[PDB]
Amino acid sequence: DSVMRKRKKKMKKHKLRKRRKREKAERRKLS
Amino acid sequence: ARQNFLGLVVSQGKMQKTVKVRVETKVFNKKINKELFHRRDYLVHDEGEISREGDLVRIEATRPLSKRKFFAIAEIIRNKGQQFALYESEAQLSVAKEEAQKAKEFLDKRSVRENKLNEKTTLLRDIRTIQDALSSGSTPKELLEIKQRYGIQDFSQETVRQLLQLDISGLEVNLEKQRSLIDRIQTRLSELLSNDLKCDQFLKDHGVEDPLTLKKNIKKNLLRKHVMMDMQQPS
Amino acid sequence: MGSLSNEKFFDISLVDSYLNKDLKNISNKIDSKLN
Amino acid sequence: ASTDKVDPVLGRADTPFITRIMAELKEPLVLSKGYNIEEVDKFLAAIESAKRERAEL
Amino acid sequence: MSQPLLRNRSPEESELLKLKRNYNRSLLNFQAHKKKLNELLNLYHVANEFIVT
Amino acid sequence: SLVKLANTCAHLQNCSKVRVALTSIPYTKLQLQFAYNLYQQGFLSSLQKGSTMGPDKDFVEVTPDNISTRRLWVGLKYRDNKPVLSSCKLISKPNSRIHLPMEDMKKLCSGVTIRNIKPLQPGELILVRAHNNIMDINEAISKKLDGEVLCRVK
Amino acid sequence: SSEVQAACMTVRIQNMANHIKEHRKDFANTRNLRILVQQRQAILRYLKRDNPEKYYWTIQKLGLNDAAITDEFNMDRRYMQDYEFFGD
RNA sequence: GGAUUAAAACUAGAGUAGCGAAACGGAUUCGAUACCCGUGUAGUUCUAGUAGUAAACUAUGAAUACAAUUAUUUAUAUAUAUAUAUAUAAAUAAUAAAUGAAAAUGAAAGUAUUCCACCUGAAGAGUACGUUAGCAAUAAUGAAACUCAAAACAAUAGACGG
Ligand SMILES: [K+]
Ligand SMILES: [K+]
Ligand SMILES: [K+]
Ligand SMILES: [K+]
Ligand SMILES: [Mg+2]
Ligand SMILES: [Mg+2]
Ligand SMILES: [Mg+2]
Ligand SMILES: [Mg+2]
Ligand SMILES: [Mg+2]
Ligand SMILES: [Mg+2]
Ligand SMILES: [Mg+2]
Ligand SMILES: [Mg+2]
Ligand SMILES: [Mg+2]
Ligand SMILES: [Mg+2]
Ligand SMILES: [Mg+2]
């Protein structure tokens, strides 16, 4: 796939990583 | 008639009077348009417990003998499984004997080497006394001992030459005889074939009946068998 | 030359002729010829 | 657990064939490159003897 | 088409073949053995220059 | 070997494309029978036994001493700027062998697709093997023989 | 002959195994050892089919058993721990 | 099924010059959580482990048979009027044929055979849930609903380019 199309997968991966970091943080405070 | 199958015994000695036999049948698979082999394992009754894993057997349908047994062993077509068991037992005994003999031949060789290391006398020195005593006339008792260390009772110039003989020398002469035989056999047959008249005579002289009436291959083999019977039997 | 060589560093020919009764069966032959 | 567990790489420990070959390689006067001491002692003595005979011809 | 595809070796042909093959293996073993002895002789000639004492 | 036969069929197609007049194939009974059928049917100009280096001019008996160096040499035909032997393909493949009864062979020669085998076309040769003998399908039908449908040549 | 090949491989397997026991991180030569052991299994499996009597004689003399030859072998980490290849 | 597997990351103990996430400062800027500069922690190093992921790419699984040329190296062999010449393989480069959506491939992406892996519109999604494994980060496995008549590749002619 072209770079243009790769960039859509890149954005999805970033948003998943951002959400999992956010969830981790909460667990630390809630723990 | 009763349905009979051919299969390979794939399990034995796990159940009492029961063996597992692998039966392969030929079926047509419409989807891939190919005649395939379909495999199934049968639990089979072995009344005499004769079959062994690896055997090729014929199984025949019987009355129900258990929840899952509906066939029995009817004949051992090939007994490779039984052979395996016999050869394994023999191997244990056969190898033990050989290893014992080899262990005794290794300790014997070690003893001889140790004994020789206890004799400070060296071949060179001993061969320098048998060549000085033979050139000076002195006969110290060392020579008598040397006549026992080597067994050389007589001390001559043709006794040191036989104490220092190397096996390579014998090999060189056996190789020349081997080459001679091959070269002679080829020249003899080569010449014989070149002269049909001398060939026909050759065969008759060696006891062939009407060799003239023979084929090239049917007769060249006779010539080859004779040329190799006149250079290997007479020698 | 082989066995009948004058080199200080000879080849196995000399050692082979010795153990094959050649350097001796030739020395006697030469001496017998001289006789 | 009662199965005869033979190491598939090294085999049974103390195999007479494996042990004897190992011992043969560690014998006192074993030589390399295909030479054997017995043949080397006779060959070296033959060189000396052969030289003397060449010095007696 | 009628000719046989293969003619098996006659027992005599197999005997001469075995003689040549045994000779080939034996000659190579002998030639290697003699080469080693010739190298042992050339090493004896120079061992007077080597130090062991 | 059907694999060897597939190799030969592909080899003949490659040689036809470049228009070489003479080529060699492995020396085996199946290969010889295959080539002989093509020769009698007019697909091959010549069929000679030989060696890896070329066809034999004089008869050379084949023995175990030279079997590994034996080859069969076949001459390809070209007329009017077209190869006579354009295509050569197996029907019965190594991984899917097809055995047909004489009744189904007659249907194949009559325009009916049997077991996905396209029917015999005008001027095409379909070879069948029966009891280790190779013959044209029409000859097998004449002899009432059942056999493996090996290949089709056009 | 398969018996000779197995014996020749045995010598090299024994030597290569000794090397690995002193060079446990030499994965390149561990891979070579694995392949050589598997090659010996293949040659002996053929021997069992070709000459069963010789096969059983050969494996007995080499110190192996039928299971060691016929069973699938990968010389994996569990093997190195179950037979204490490296000791401790 | 097994083994090995970059970088980052983690466990334990050593090491720590230089480099350098982060953090704290200096600049730039309308703003500058940046690009540039300073101080520089983890890390980068070694030992013993965990983990098994990369654009882990030739984006091209492995094996076998086969097909037209040239050039250039390499290797082996042969010869001599001894330094070249003649052979046979391999590698690489450019090609014929053939193949292909074309770009191109070229001894395969050709002609064939055998075996394995994998794919079936886009998005949702390599996500959710469950499970297995790991100290952990995570890794493997891996959907459906809803919505749409799209979506993608090669090539062509333009336009534009700090
Ligand atoms: K019962
Ligand atoms: K540091
Ligand atoms: K790359
Ligand atoms: K694969
Ligand atoms: Mg893709
Ligand atoms: Mg193998
Ligand atoms: Mg640390
Ligand atoms: Mg900085
Ligand atoms: Mg690991
Ligand atoms: Mg990942
Ligand atoms: Mg991946
Ligand atoms: Mg890489
Ligand atoms: Mg391979
Ligand atoms: Mg995941
Ligand atoms: Mg494009």
UniProtKB/Swiss-Prot annotation, chain A:
GO process terms (BP): mitochondrial ribosome assembly; mitochondrial translation; mitochondrial translational initiation; mRNA processing
Ranges of biased composition (kind: Basic and acidic residues): 23-31
Positions of the UniProt region annotated as Disordered: 5-31
Compositional bias of kind Basic residues: 5-22
Example of a GO MF term: structural constituent of ribosome
GO (cellular component) term, any one: mitochondrial inner membrane
Keywords of this entry: Membrane, Mitochondrion, Mitochondrion inner membrane, mRNA processing, Ribonucleoprotein, Ribosomal protein
Main localization category: mitochondrion
Compartments where located: Mitochondrion; Mitochondrion inner membrane
Entry function: Component of the mitochondrial ribosome (mitoribosome), a dedicated translation machinery responsible for the synthesis of mitochondrial genome-encoded proteins, including at least some of the essential transmembrane subunits of the mitochondrial respiratory chain. The mitoribosomes are attached to the mitochondrial inner membrane and translation products are cotranslationally integrated into the membrane. mS38 is also involved in the splicing of the COX1 mRNA.
Subunit structure: Component of the mitochondrial small ribosomal subunit (mt-SSU). Mature yeast 74S mitochondrial ribosomes consist of a small (37S) and a large (54S) subunit. The 37S small subunit contains a 15S ribosomal RNA (15S mt-rRNA) and 34 different proteins. The 54S large subunit contains a 21S rRNA (21S mt-rRNA) and 46 different proteins.
Protein family according to the UniProt entry: Belongs to the mitochondrion-specific ribosomal protein mS38 family.
Segment of the intact protein contained: 78 to 108 of 111
Curated annotation (Swiss-Prot), chain C:
UniProt name for this protein: Small ribosomal subunit protein mS26
Role this protein plays: Component of the mitochondrial ribosome (mitoribosome), a dedicated translation machinery responsible for the synthesis of mitochondrial genome-encoded proteins, including at least some of the essential transmembrane subunits of the mitochondrial respiratory chain. The mitoribosomes are attached to the mitochondrial inner membrane and translation products are cotranslationally integrated into the membrane.
Assembly, per entry: Component of the mitochondrial small ribosomal subunit (mt-SSU). Mature yeast 74S mitochondrial ribosomes consist of a small (37S) and a large (54S) subunit. The 37S small subunit contains a 15S ribosomal RNA (15S mt-rRNA) and 34 different proteins. The 54S large subunit contains a 21S rRNA (21S mt-rRNA) and 46 different proteins.
Location(s) in or outside the cell: Mitochondrion
Note: Present with 2010 molecules/cell in log phase SD medium.
Family from the record: Belongs to the mitochondrion-specific ribosomal protein mS26 family.
Domain of life: Eukaryota
Gene name per UniProt: PET123
UniProtKB/Swiss-Prot annotation, chain F:
SUPFAM superfamilies per record: Ribosomal protein S8
Database matches in InterPro entries: Ribosomal_uS8, Ribosomal_uS8_sf
A Pfam cross-reference name: Ribosomal_S8
Purpose of the protein: Component of the mitochondrial ribosome (mitoribosome), a dedicated translation machinery responsible for the synthesis of mitochondrial genome-encoded proteins, including at least some of the essential transmembrane subunits of the mitochondrial respiratory chain. The mitoribosomes are attached to the mitochondrial inner membrane and translation products are cotranslationally integrated into the membrane.
Record's subunit section: Component of the mitochondrial small ribosomal subunit (mt-SSU). Mature yeast 74S mitochondrial ribosomes consist of a small (37S) and a large (54S) subunit. The 37S small subunit contains a 15S ribosomal RNA (15S mt-rRNA) and 34 different proteins. The 54S large subunit contains a 21S rRNA (21S mt-rRNA) and 46 different proteins.
Domain of life: Eukaryota
Family statement: Belongs to the universal ribosomal protein uS8 family.
Keyword match Disulfide bond: no
PANTHER family registered for this protein in UniProt: 40S RIBOSOMAL PROTEIN S15A
GO molecular function: structural constituent of ribosome
Keyword Metal-binding: no
GO cellular component terms attached to this protein's record: mitochondrial inner membrane; mitochondrial small ribosomal subunit; mitochondrion
Cellular compartments annotated: Mitochondrion
Keywords: Mitochondrion, Ribonucleoprotein, Ribosomal protein
Main subcellular localisation: mitochondrion
Protein name (database record): Small ribosomal subunit protein uS8m
Gene Ontology BP, a term: mitochondrial translation
Gene: MRPS8
Curated annotation (Swiss-Prot), chain G:
Family (UniProt): Belongs to the universal ribosomal protein uS15 family.
Designated name of the protein: Small ribosomal subunit protein uS15m
Post-translational modification comment from the UniProt entry: The precursor is processed in two steps involving mitochondrial intermediate peptidase (MIP) and mitochondrial processing peptidase (MPP).
Miscellaneous field: Present with 6960 molecules/cell in log phase SD medium.
Organism: Saccharomyces cerevisiae (strain ATCC 204508 / S288c) (Baker's yeast)
Function: Component of the mitochondrial ribosome (mitoribosome), a dedicated translation machinery responsible for the synthesis of mitochondrial genome-encoded proteins, including at least some of the essential transmembrane subunits of the mitochondrial respiratory chain. The mitoribosomes are attached to the mitochondrial inner membrane and translation products are cotranslationally integrated into the membrane.
Subcellular location: Mitochondrion
Subunit composition and interactions: Component of the mitochondrial small ribosomal subunit (mt-SSU). Mature yeast 74S mitochondrial ribosomes consist of a small (37S) and a large (54S) subunit. The 37S small subunit contains a 15S ribosomal RNA (15S mt-rRNA) and 34 different proteins. The 54S large subunit contains a 21S rRNA (21S mt-rRNA) and 46 different proteins.
